[model samples]
Target chain A: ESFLYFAYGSNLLTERIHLRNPSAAFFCVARLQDFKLDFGNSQGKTSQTWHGGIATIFQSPGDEVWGVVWKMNKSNLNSLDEQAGVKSGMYVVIEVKVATQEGKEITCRSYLMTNYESAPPSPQYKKIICMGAKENGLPLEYQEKLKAIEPNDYTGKVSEEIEDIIKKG
Target chain B: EESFLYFAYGSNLLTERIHLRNPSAAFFCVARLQDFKLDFGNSQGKTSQTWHGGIATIFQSPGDEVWGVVWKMNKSNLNSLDEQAGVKSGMYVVIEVKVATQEGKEITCRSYLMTNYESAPPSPQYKKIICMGAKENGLPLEYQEKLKAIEPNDYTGKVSEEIEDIIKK
Candidate 1:
């Protein structure tokens, strides 16, 4: 069995996601209506690995977030949740319906963080996100918006594991 | 116009609580939402002012199950029901789900889910209402026990004048 996942953050990068979920395959670019992308620390605690806020989505009417949908085997569920910090309560799973460019709505699983405290993304993090956005052929306007996101200017290595993935790519 | 089917798994499971806003609701049948799990949380990590604690929501969890009452509600009550769920404020979003009856019949119904929330214990009053409703509806004994076993927060204060009036009866 397989399930669809909406990836709007670092996981949007094929290399970043393949590190854990080997079965993840690109499905399509979809739009999540009434939700806006946000960056925040979980429970006000900075990420130990990223050293900056991470991506989350919140309900905001009239707003939309463009993301890539990936289809993966159900076997990857545990690994996906582990990577998202579900057991640690850093994030919770949510099911959402995203609209494809063709106007078809598909239900998929996503994640949302709790106790959100807004913070800037690290330069490394933002760069990876922009790279993924451009790689996936997201909307040009949305890609521009992502490129314009202000980063925290952190110059240190975020994660050796993540660095290795990008280095390989 | 015809009525709509709604699956109530939380406070709305109680006829009185549901009637507080949606008077057009009529008892339909008890159904099991397959592969979903019942959860409690406060929207955006803020405590619920009305219930004084977390409120009920559901998340997709394979192999798990949530039992609920399906109500046949008139179309006229749609707005009122949505208002009661705080849909306009993004507290919850309506979704269509397929539930199974005891006779193994599948029925599609409308349900509400909180996409952005923080896990928190329900208030004693809130839990009690759920337990009462479970018993009132003759739901499965094991399910009733499960609902009764849920730990509630230590909130002794009155929930609200409206709910207090309901409980007073």
Candidate 2:
């Protein structure tokens, strides 16, 4: 442990994101203050859990999310960004103030990738959307969409754009 | 090749997450999109062909990365989910979106390389977490220990004390 922490949930689960380095480490669930966890994003490209925005060390009083952190070296950090596909459309790195295991609050940079605009209703997207809805303890419009959706199978996918829906919704 | 995509570059590379996504998701990656390669393959890419040309890790952005495999999933919002997961515009995201499969024209998907590039090493302490992540993900305990024995060449550049707390915990 040196200076930063990366909170991962979506595809970056305990098993996924840690592979960046031959040594990226993991830990049990820890709570961070002033953040929120939501699956309004990352539902498209990857299915391995990189589907939500959680626990941001925010500038304003927000909420918190339970997550784990991966410890790695500089090269491994770079590997993380490489895997994340920064800036363009896949992921974005940000800084969040968090509470460390020692109960110390600190701010560090993290990441966020896009999931979907969340409109329309394909049976596949609907299942995962429902899961997100379930995880968040909420619901969205489109009850009909829910009927057709199955579960998000946590596989992978190619670039896809579901036309029309987000705006109308 | 049944309508699935397996986009994994981290611990998912170890096959644990793959089991969770779908016990039947095939595992194979001989292609190189951008500079894709396994993070831990070939002595941590220091002496092997795990394709050591690019640097891809978590948290950092703006780099090329390894694109895992494709899998089969058919959710209602599957395509929209992929976009949010990181397949939109400039993100240079790395994932395997759904596509046509050769399996009886059943129209399945395969993992793909969404994006790729190069990077530098991060921190050293983070290596400890990397090791921890491997163990958690399904790397044999012995193999995880072996990885720990080595001094990681990764310089991903962003290690934090949180990583140590995780390892020591």
Candidate 3:
């Protein structure tokens, strides 16, 4: 079995998702209606490497989050869940209805922080997601807003394994 | 002429409340919406004797269902309904939903979903209005009892009168 997944963070980068789930293939740019994106987790933990915080989606009626959708084999769900820290309850998979720029509705799964303290993102983390937004051609205004998100000046090292995939294509 | 279907799950469940804002609303029937739950978590823009703290919103909760009244309204009241929902202030947004009637007929309806605010509980009088509507509409007896059981803010003023003054013109 296979699944459709929505990506709104660094995973928006094809390279990033490809590195984590080899079977992940770019589908299309989609917009999640009535959701607001923020950085935090259920526990409110922050990471110096990812910048200050992680990404989570909140229900904000009428707002929208633009991102990429990918098609992946269900075989990779475990690895994807592990990467998203699902077992630890850091994030929970949520089913959402997203619309294509051309107006088709698609149901897919995404992640939302379970235990989180709302916090800003790390500069590097923000940069990556923004880069992905630009790469995938999200709405120009949305891209501008993502770019405007304040990030901490935390100069830190990330895992060398994923570092290789964070570069621009 | 075409009529738009409007869903009322909050105080608007009271026909009088909506009539005060948009006199053209005509009761259609009760609708059962799936996969969402009512929450008094969104703060209102203005505080009143009828409601305190936060008002109401519907957040996604799979496996849950919400019951509301559906009203048939014409184009003349669209702007009034929008204003009543605080569209300009970003308090609420109109979203389309597929709801089932008691007879199992499915239809699409529009409802005001709160999108803005800090978290807060509804005031006592607010509960009174909700319970009143529930009873007036003769919703499921258990649901009516649940609405009646909600703790209300301990306001000293005449609650229903204040709301009546505003919504009963």
Candidate 4:
């Protein structure tokens, strides 16, 4: 009965979402226009040294941003905040005008995790680069971007941590 | 297209009906009527009181008798058969014959597997019975008689299970 507009990103994995929210119904992914969402440096609104970038002027009109609209209660959002570094001082909420399923105008909240600068590195970036290369089959310029995107220090460090976790098992 | 006409007599559990008959790409459950000799299809003997009279006799009506919704089907419909059924229909049910529209113009067809609670099991002859009973509740006497005639021979008579289940439902 009592529901709130749910914005999700990390927890939007289709199968994983099913476990998090029992009644998680499917709504289509949407693109937030006239706005930019990225991970980077910002003013000291958060406890961390790094912060998220503001609405940078970037043109990716055709690019799709994958997230979910969960018809859920407020408590659910609070839990989500806890998981996504919201109240934990890792991320902050940004209010912006957004469109809904019916293309109606509404103000919505999007969370951004600060401290991308401090992020060690990740193989995921390499994976994403390979994916882009495979999809667009871009020219030498974008292929060079893929080569530059591969292999991040953060992923290497995180992977070590994961290996330890598994070793602990 | 390899179409087939299927006549429904009992509860319209289509999972089984569609499988055995045409493997039709599409099945049309049209509400029509026709004539059938009651003696042709029947599972139980004659009785009264606790059990109504059960005898095979050709029944007449003002117009074509309605056995059940006639399902018009086409070829290549078999690949999608055997859909995952829940507790309503048991795991591994059989596919059987279904009848066409009461117009009796098309070939007889089949139906899917439904819960036994919907109607009784016909002795593996008619398509579905409860579907016919449901239609009978809607149409007139002549149509009812038409359904009765097409039943029995058209399907199995073990519909007691389905009948009892419906009673409880």
Q: In candidate 2, what are the lDDT values of residues B113-156, reduced to their tens digit?
A: 22222343323443454454555544445545545665556554
Which candidate's DockQ is highest?
Answer: 1
Fraction of native Cα contacts reproduced by each candidate? 0.09, 0.00, 0.05, 0.00
Error of 3 at B4 (Å): 1.5
Question: Every prediction's TM-score for the first chain?
Answer: 0.94, 0.51, 0.91, 0.49
Each model's DockQ score: 0.13, 0.02, 0.06, 0.00
lDDT of 2 by residue, A1-169 (tens): 3435555343233323433454655533344554434333343433332322221122112444445555566555556666655534455544444565578655444665432333232333444333433333322332233344343344444223221221222
For every model in order, what is the number of clashing pairs? 0, 109, 12, 70
Chain B TM-score (model 2 vs. true structure): 0.35
Categorize the docking of model 2: incorrect
Q: Is candidate 3 or candidate 4 better by lDDT?
A: 3
- Residue A67 lDDT, candidate 4, scale 0-100: 35
lDDT tens per residue, model 1, A125-153: 88788878888999999999898888886
Looking at candidate 3 chain B, the ten consecutive residues that score lowest on lDDT are B41-50
Using lDDT as the measure, what is the rank order of every candidate, best first? Answer: 1, 3, 2, 4
TM-score of 3: 0.57
Q: Could you tell me the TM-score of chain B in model 4?
A: 0.33
lDDT tens digits, residues A1-169, model 3? 8888999998887666777687888899999877788886345556545757788876666778999999989888768878986545566555566899889988787777634678888766787787789888888999999988987667776766556545533
